Design a protein around this ligand. Sequence first.
Ligand SMILES: CC(=O)N[C@@H]1[C@@H](O)[C@H](O[C@@H]2O[C@H](CO)[C@@H](O[C@@H]3O[C@H](CO)[C@@H](O[C@@H]4O[C@H](CO)[C@@H](O)[C@H](O)[C@H]4NC(C)=O)[C@H](O)[C@H]3NC(C)=O)[C@H](O)[C@H]2NC(C)=O)[C@@H](CO)O[C@H]1O
Ligand SMILES: [Zn+2]
Ligand SMILES: [Zn+2]
Ligand SMILES: [Zn+2]
Ligand SMILES: [Zn+2]
Length: 242
Amino acid sequence: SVSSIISHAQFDRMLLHRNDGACQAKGFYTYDAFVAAANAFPGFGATGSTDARKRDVAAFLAQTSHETTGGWATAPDGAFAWGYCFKQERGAAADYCTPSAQWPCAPGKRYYGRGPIQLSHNYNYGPAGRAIGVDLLRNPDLVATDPTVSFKTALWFWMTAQAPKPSSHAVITGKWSPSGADRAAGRAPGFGVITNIINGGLECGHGQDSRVADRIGFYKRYCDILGVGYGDNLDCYNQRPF
Ligand SMILES: CC(=O)N[C@@H]1[C@@H](O)[C@H](O[C@@H]2O[C@H](CO)[C@@H](O[C@@H]3O[C@H](CO)[C@@H](O[C@@H]4O[C@H](CO)[C@@H](O)[C@H](O)[C@H]4NC(C)=O)[C@H](O)[C@H]3NC(C)=O)[C@H](O)[C@H]2NC(C)=O)[C@@H](CO)O[C@H]1O
Ligand SMILES: [Zn+2]
Ligand SMILES: [Zn+2]
Ligand SMILES: [Zn+2]
Ligand SMILES: [Zn+2]
């Protein structure tokens, strides 16, 4: 049904060079996997006005593109045409296993970044897996080997609140009610607060930031392709982190 908001053609135009030879995940991310994953999160791309629905999709793909970008300044078609180039945290990484009786680490497994949102740590693989009905604590690699599972973990993140942080979905579809603390911190609804939700401690509230600008670059390019306005408050340069 999200297919009513973004066509296969638009999807490939957005994630243009993801299957180029230099991309680690070439061949992995497919439109069919995206659509299948979206079916498990009915509200995604189907909540709010047509414009809100388009932005919900554009913002999701933009923030996940940043997490998996293969872009660079002199890249063909610009840096914002290289989202979804990777599916696993680069380098030697780490175990990302912390003591937890609720989401215990499985022996020998590592919970480094995987998929569109670079899901990390046992305490995130745990609830994400439960949400999609897959044991990701015992088989975390599925996030990097099954594209449908991969996209589902990212949508789980997109649709899940971390109170006081609202879900990114709620913000972009205009369903978030900022608190007095949010208003005092300058956190107004828009793409900017979503960046804050994802990595504000490190990127927000300290003026112009290239990481924030990269996220915005992807978002504008994707909104342009779907033909929707960006909405207001795109950056978080003056927002206090959550
Ligand atoms: C001078 C010149 O022309 N050099 C070219 C190279 O730049 C180019 O390779 C590309 O280089 C950029 C950096 O310059 C690189 O971008 C990095 O990509 C990784 C992977 O996605 C990002 O890592 C993510 O960071 C977030 C936030 O920290 C994490 O949450 C997330 O887990 C990470 N994701 C993963 C999978 O690890 C970096 O943030 C990002 N760095 C920057 C500054 O944006 C591209 O990936 C490189 N592209 C490719 C295809 O390798 C090279 C291309 O061939 O060409 C050179 O000429
Ligand atoms: Zn295609
Ligand atoms: Zn290409
Ligand atoms: Zn850690
Ligand atoms: Zn700072």
